[model samples]
Target chain A: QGQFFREIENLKEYFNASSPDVAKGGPLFSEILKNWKDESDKKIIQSQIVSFYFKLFENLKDNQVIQRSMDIIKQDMFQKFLNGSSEKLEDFKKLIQIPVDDLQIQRKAINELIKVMND
Target chain B: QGQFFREIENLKEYFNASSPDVAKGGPLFSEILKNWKDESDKKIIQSQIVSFYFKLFENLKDNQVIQRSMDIIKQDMFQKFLNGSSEKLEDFKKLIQIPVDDLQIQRKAINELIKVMND
Candidate 1:
């Protein structure tokens, strides 16, 4: 949980320090960043990205039970995202809580992530 | 649920049409619009804000029972955010799920909402 919190803070800093250095974030983050240049838009996206981690941290802190095969998600989500394999992509979906079935939010996130991963 | 979905769509349109006319959105949205100028930052904030509504919509769609005094929240959230009284402010917190005990995420969200309300 603390690790997730720290990661969220790191993300916050990465977005906040958006001068010349924001692009120094890893490949996936940089790829996500490529979608826009507007500060207002980036601020919202940064909040969403950070909030995503914060949600994960809070969920972990609450010590929720595993309803299914979330063990893969609870471990090394970034590592999974780093590799662009179909199996790794499936793992990333679990990490983000995207269901096997379609939903608007999940679809949008998956599409964007797939695009970024492809990049 | 449908109402919330339509509102989310409207919000997406407002954010995506980022041009000279984007500022023509209503006062509260326009107030949020005052925060940033960069497209990247705006894109993220837009995502965050839209995601916020999506969560609310999903929760309502799930037909969750009122655990407490959430009836007020289920009613006119936009109305509360507009008038900006202390009582109304409290209601907005309820609408956004801010707890009595402050959390980091809650604090940041409350601060941003308060700042926007003041404008």
Candidate 2:
């Protein structure tokens, strides 16, 4: 729980850092980045995530730096499929838990780990 | 739709072959190994899948046969978070689309692409 909370905090911080205003202010935040409560709910979120990912992949799929990135995502998704598993919405909720009042929510989820780690 | 059906069909065949009883018989089957349709639905499925994969990964995380496999899944999940996306419950619907009638469903998901192709 502590690690989860801390990681979520870090995730929150990472989102704020993406913006000059939030970065300079350096305020804490929490909110659900996305929600899933049932099978249909899970499906909707999964589809959106996959679809967006597929699109991001389509965009960066050609980039040299991002190719390895794409392969990683492909393997992850397929591996889960191979193993008969899926990512929980709660895990994501924990990762992105933040106050909606904060404007940095969107960037945090997408923020690069290396940058977040360094920051 | 056609590709999805074919993949599910192949998945079915793979599942049956995984079991000597079914493999010997080599018959087609269909059923929902799992089902979800709401917010809670998605979370349960995702958590279960992740949990199971995590276990399999724990068993074989050290194996050369599965290292790259783990990496693929990590990239896929993280990439989705970084981009503020989620996998659609429905897309998985397509990938693991096998009916519950077959026993080989589990094996097909975990089965290696190389071996499956060779067979």
Candidate 3:
């Protein structure tokens, strides 16, 4: 438990230190735009990338970092894009927890470990 | 986010360093047993502590530390105790994710931040 707490602190420290790159028209978002060429496939590709970032945020365990990111995100133009459907954005965040909580998911995770031990 | 990724590595580093104390009947578990008095409240207290540890494990994002801890845990006598009902153990693990995924919980989290920002 102490170990986990320490890990969370380390994560938060690292997060705050590296946040500026994500500040304004930074590399992370810039790369997403640089890849865009046309409206057709570009829109679909951007959607996937957006989901990817949301999923990444959802996976994070430090609430403070997440809260900090959300505050930082509010300033980013990307938030407006995601804000298009706040309900869906909210739902996507909520749904990410489903697999994490599922009994089947835990069983599968444990089973995977058991399998590793067996082999 | 590049920031989040860097944070995960730092967390993993910190986790590995602090894992030894959790290796044996170490400080983490020893404290629980030390606080024990009798079968009446002690069992319940131990149960709560165990749940606390399991919940801590579930909140963790790095699969490696969890897996490593499990492997280390296998060597500890505590595992046999917890193994008494592997099913219950698994269920306890599964249940930990519920609050993390709930829309109401996320809404509450967001609301808490909004309140903070307001202040």
Candidate 4:
């Protein structure tokens, strides 16, 4: 978990150093998403990805970005995490368990995601 | 394309023979989805899967089923195709073109899917 959190930091740094294109469906995030081989690694990465999206959702509320991120969640990216392995899926469920208050967007997004994951 | 369309028929048969459990995110569909190797095969399966969903949306309009199928579309299952290869994505886009007039649900679903795929 520590290692994964560090990687999450790395992901955040990459996002910060990057430009708008990265945020707008750029290759960097996609590559990270596709590269991880282990199911747990992929689940961790997905959790981080959702965390990243939540950050943007709260600060920017940029509908375009929100829509894209929502689409990402709506698509198989997150669904695969749910359907991958039962243990990993359970872990992912705990990971996205509404981390903080004042995150209406994240709350809504996480709730929406949890609903899908349940399915 | 003929070969693929034939497989689509097979998929339809399997869906019909199966119960609502399969239609509701059952492992059968997921297994079929995961079994295909070739990208074209997967794309064809996805298009067929969408067609299946549209069929349900039109005939059943069951919110639970629609929600489940929509969740399937929202996941990496579909997004991977977009991120996989350009030609395949183009082919998929063409395959999902709103096929009929009374398919507003499908039209909306496909349009939403296309929006995500484009991103």
Candidate 5:
């Protein structure tokens, strides 16, 4: 666990997913979240995101689509995190989880993406 | 200009960046947006974003960080679009724009990304 943390530190040297300069928490982010479910993974996820985001911005900064996709993912997770708020400590100990399928349509599409990724 | 629309259409067949089945717009999305300023390229951006998002979901669906990044980005753009509100037809014809830097720290980082991207 000690060394594992060090790896994240080294990674942070470049990643810094959520900028240290910016302040985001339950309130600012939650304001936009009429919806939510949890938190814990917040910082780790944030670090990785900033890492990928900066990378994309540098290489394809002009590529708005890629950039925006990145931006959305960040908010989505934050929204998810905001849900971590407590209605009560009693509520906190509750079970965790949330999904689904239908759409033979989806089955077909998944294959196309699988094919694309290999190439 | 006419041909441009067609190209986007072809892209849409695969991309549907924001799902057609899901409902999102000024009211639902704006609830989260206490902030705003614009709209217009909404659909085009939406299409591309969902396209990439779904692709990432398939390839790295279980990869929580990547998937969450995609989710946050979707909300971010939609939040942006919800700004295209109409207080009045009189208010509609206005200008558009909204950034900055500091962080001698930032200056060094830009180069790192440039270097990394080439690899």
Candidate 6:
């Protein structure tokens, strides 16, 4: 795990400096979401991520199509995450946990991510 | 050029701090958008991407599925940039004709982006 983490650190650095042009998008990324879900292995996890991106993208776009799509996915994921059972929790744990050391990083990674997911 | 120069810095930084989760969705990106006339790219950049992922595995698990369907073209891109493109100028020569340094930052970024795009 330690050695794998060291390689992960190198991968992170490589990605950070990869391409400035790729970073152009902010949050408005809702258009292709269903395609993502259709291709996902975990429906709930897909729902969780799609939910978050949908909301943030809506916030960024504030358009009708984008906002509507965001609204639907947002509701679905939040309900899944909030009302989901231990089984669902296990599902989430299985799919989403990153095992990082920093809480703030974790929040940036997941908690705060799901915070405004349905907003 | 001068006006486009200054504020692009802020926009650049605002996006750079984005969490890495957004980065993973880079490939499976397609699906969002009501109508982008230029949608007819050389080929469907999306299917090419999805095909790559689908071929990578016979079947993906849940989290793996999320990793596969990056079909959403959003999460920040020209779409979001265009959400605010009313400030954009037509041609660089036209943009420079105006007192761009005095124009709002919106116009500045738009024109600059257009310049970068047309390049």
Off by over 4 Å in 5: A7-119, B1-50, B53-119
On lDDT, the candidate that comes out on top is 3
- DockQ top scorer: 1
Could you tell me how far off, in angstroms, the CA of residue B99 lies in candidate 3 after the best superposition?
4.4
Candidate 1: stretches off by over 4 Å: A1-49, A55-119, B1-28, B35-41, B62-119
lDDT minimum window of 10 residues, candidate 3 chain B: B107-116
Would you list the rank order by lDDT, best first?
A: 3, 1, 2, 4, 5, 6
Residue-level lDDT for B1 in candidate 3: 20
What is the Cα-based lDDT of residue B41 in candidate 5? 18
Q: For each candidate, what TM-score against the reference?
A: 0.21, 0.23, 0.25, 0.20, 0.17, 0.17
Worst 10 residues of 5 chain B by lDDT: B91-100
Alpha-carbon local distance difference test for all models:
0.32, 0.31, 0.33, 0.31, 0.28, 0.27
Cα error of candidate 2 at position A29, Å? 12
DockQ metric for all predictions: 0.05, 0.03, 0.02, 0.02, 0.03, 0.02
Per residue, candidate 2 scores C-alpha lDDT tens digits across B1-119 of 12223332233333223344522221211111223323322223333333223333333465554355444444454323232445442233332322232311111111122211322
**Model 2, span A13-108: residue lDDT tens:** 332224554222212111212223323323223333343333333444545444654555444443322233354422333322122322221211
Question: Which numbered prediction scores highest in TM-score against the true structure?
Answer: 3
Best of the two (3, 4) by DockQ: 3
Give the alpha carbon lDDT tens digit for every residue of B1-119 in model 4: 12222332333333244353323433333333343333321122233333333333333334653444434433433333233333333333323333232221111111112112322
CAPRI rating of model 1:
incorrect
- Model 1, A1-119: lDDT tens per residue? 12443433333343223365433334543333343323231222333333344354445432233312123333433332123232333323333433232232321211111111221
Query: Model 3's A-chain: what TM-score?
Result: 0.37
Clashing pairs in 3: none
Model 4 stretches astray by more than 4 angstroms? A1-46, A57-59, A63-76, A84-119, B1-119
lDDT tens per residue, model 5, A15-82: 34445643232233223212211332112222222333333344433354344443433333332222
